């Protein structure tokens, strides 16, 4: 089971209308049994529709979807999108983190985390959740720290300890400095194991930042991770791109992991 | 041709007070 999280800079109609860039996005998505796409700026879901049109142009059930409404503290809004192969896993339930009350999810998060419960037959973990988060760069420390509370929420609602938290956490450089790690419960609690290390470069840009992450909780899930399989996926190297072309795809690499 | 048509047409001329109603108007353009 190959799983990934991928901030696609302003993924939207303009981008998916461009045959070349669509082409690369499709090829990239095709790598994965489950993939989280972030920064979806797609007001009427047209871009989500095109991508799915491509992913399913042969077999209509190659990929299924879970998509959120537009989300964001203010007028700037994004969606979370989960794409998954129904032949490789199944979606049991999904919800949006809300902190027990309607607008209350916006109290911790600019983009209230989408949470998906999956069933997986081909791995040691039979059931796990994935919590998506694209944090607000300026509030990254609090938002990653708040993820600890999301985990408690999941545990309580689904009586389930196997939880993967992932996405563009903005977890590095000027937004999370090394001295601030001691204040993120998600990092200091032994319940969580951090698969993309601080040293990883997950930006397609000049910066050296471990912005995008994959954290796993629960012995079963943890013990299902293929050792050494978690890495950013540098698609500029992979596809032999100029940097200009890489950047037109996104300013982040996907981060990926493999479960067994 | 019905019975009581003229009285109907007379009542449409007199007009009628109608009741305050908040419309759930979802026709506005979605601007992004």
């Amino acid at each position: 089971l190959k799983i990934a999280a991928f901030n696609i800079r302003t993924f939207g109609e303009t981008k998916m209308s461009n045959a070349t860039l669509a082409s690369y996005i499709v090829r990239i998505v095709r790598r994965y049994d489950i993939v989280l796409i972030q920064e979806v700026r797609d007001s009427h879901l047209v871009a989500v529709g095109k991508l799915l049109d491509y992913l399913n142009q042969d077999d209509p059930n190659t990929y299924h979807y879970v998509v959120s409404e537009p989300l964001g503290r203010n007028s700037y809004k994004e969606r979370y999108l989960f794409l998954f192969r129904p032949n490789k896993v199944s979606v049991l339930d999904t919800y949006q983190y809300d902190d027990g009350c309607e607008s209350c999810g916006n109290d911790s998060f600019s983009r209230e985390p989408a949470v998906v419960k999956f069933s997986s037959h081909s791995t040691k973990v039979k059931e796990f959740a994935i919590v998506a988060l694209h944090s607000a760069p300026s509030d990254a420390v609090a938002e990653i720290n708040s993820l600890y509370d999301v985990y408690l929420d999941v545990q309580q609602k689904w009586h389930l300890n196997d939880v993967m938290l992932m996405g563009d956490f903005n977890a590095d450089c000027s937004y999370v400095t090394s001295s601030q790690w001691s204040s993120i419960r998600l990092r200091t609690s032994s319940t969580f194991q951090w698969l993309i290390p601080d040293s990883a470069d997950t930006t397609a840009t000049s910066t050296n930042c471990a912005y995008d992450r994959i954290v796993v909780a629960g012995s079963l899930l943890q013990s299902s991770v293929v050792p050494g399989s978690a890495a950013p996926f540098d698609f500029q190297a992979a596809y032999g791109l100029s940097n200009e072309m890489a950047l037109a795809i996104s300013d982040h690499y996907p981060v990926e992991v493999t479960l067994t | 041709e019905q019975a009581g048509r003229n009285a109907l047409l007379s009542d449409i001329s007199k007009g009628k007070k109608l009741k305050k109603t908040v419309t759930n108007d979802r026709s506005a353009p979605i601007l992004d």
């Binding site: 879901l45 979807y65 998509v67 919800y95 | 109907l8 009542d11 449409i12 109603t21 419309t23």
Partner: protein, 372 residues
């Protein structure tokens, strides 16, 4: 107390609510979508189909259908989905216990009126229903029973001469140009000056600029001259991303199309000329009353200035001394609905419903005699 429903089906918008009310409880897009792919919205279960506002906002993962073209219903399975959504989701009521007034376009074919009736009785099981002609209802809403309506919505524009409550089929004019063509033409002329509108949101934005900044010039050629020699008519308009664009003569060239359809390649007479041609196809006696009672209804008559322009255009056409009066009520976007709410809550109307009992005996073709 048993309240009647009023439902005005349009090419672009459904307007629905309760007789006796000053306005519809619900206005949403006349659209039905079935998902092109398998998946769910977060927190939700899987859905076979969406209607109205939800379909519009998720269109990109759907296949949409507009069951109503130029005001006429052409797709029954889908119209059925829309009326269902209307009762159960929008108005939150049980059809089997409300009389329901429905509207139809002018010149609606008989078979159409019958299928409408049949569905109401045999599918939704209403206690009683009625069908009225839209132009007529918006005449009614303005407190009158003789006159001429100009109804201009999203797909279609009619001139409907009415006499003592009855539309005059023989003199009705239909012009195949309305809100949508107007939106497209603004989009065309905004582009011609270098702007770009190709995303779905970006097309939605053109409509917004139309509805908020457009108007009809009292004299098109003087307006052109003014805009050519001063910024006095320029208007800033602010996009989501906050940057600003300027809108000059496009503001009034867009709606001018209603008077000069050649602006978009059509060979039609304009709405002023069709209004006049319709009156002139009528009885000599009734013409004075048509001229003094020119009512305007529908979203596409909302343009600031349009009544004044019509006023002037008709005077130039008509006999030198004819009394002319254009009635352009502020609530006119929803006059059809409003006249329906009046008609269906009036005491003296309570006998004119077609009942389940009558339909059972006579059948769907009873809708012609009983909806005179």
């Amino acid at each position: 107390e048993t309240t009647a429903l009023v439902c005005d089906n349009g090419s672009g918008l459904v307007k629905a609510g309760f007789a006796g009310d000053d306005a519809p409880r619900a206005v949403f897009p006349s659209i039905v979508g079935r998902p092109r792919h398998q998946g769910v919205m977060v927190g939700m279960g899987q859905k076979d189909s969406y209607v109205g506002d939800e379909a519009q906002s998720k269109r990109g993962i759907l296949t949409l259908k507009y069951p109503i073209e130029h005001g006429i219903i052409t797709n029954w399975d889908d119209m059925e989905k829309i009326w269902h959504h209307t009762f159960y989701n929008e108005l939150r009521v049980a059809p089997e216990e409300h009389p329901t007034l429905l509207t139809e376009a002018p010149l609606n074919p008989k078979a159409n009126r019958e299928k409408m009736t049949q569905i109401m009785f045999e599918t939704f099981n209403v206690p009683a229903m009625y069908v009225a002609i839209q132009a007529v209802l918006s005449l009614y809403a303005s407190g009158r029973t003789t006159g001429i309506v100009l109804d201009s919505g999203d797909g279609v524009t009619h001139n409907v001469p009415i006499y003592e409550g009855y539309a005059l089929p023989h003199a009705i004019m239909r012009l195949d140009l309305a809100g949508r063509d107007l939106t497209d033409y603004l989009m065309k002329i905004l582009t011609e000056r270098g702007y770009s509108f190709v995303t779905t949101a970006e097309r939605e934005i053109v409509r917004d600029i139309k509805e908020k900044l457009c108007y009809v010039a009292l004299d098109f050629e003087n307006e052109m001259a003014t805009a050519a020699s001063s910024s006095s008519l320029e208007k800033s308009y602010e996009l989501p991303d906050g940057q600003v664009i300027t809108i000059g003569n496009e503001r009034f060239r867009c709606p001018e199309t209603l008077f000069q359809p050649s602006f978009i390649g059509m060979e039609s007479a304009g709405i002023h000329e069709t209004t006049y041609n319709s009156i002139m196809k009528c009885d000599i006696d009734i013409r004075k009353d048509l001229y003094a009672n020119n009512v305007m209804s529908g979203g596409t008559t909302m343009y600031p200035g349009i009544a004044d322009r019509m006023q002037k255009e008709i005077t130039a056409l008509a006999p030198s001394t004819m009394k002319i009066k254009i009635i352009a009520p502020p609530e006119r976007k929803y006059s059809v609905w409003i006249g329906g709410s009046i008609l269906a809550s009036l005491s003296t109307f309570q006998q004119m419903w077609i009942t389940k009992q009558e339909y059972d005996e006579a059948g769907p073709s009873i809708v012609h005699r009983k909806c005179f």
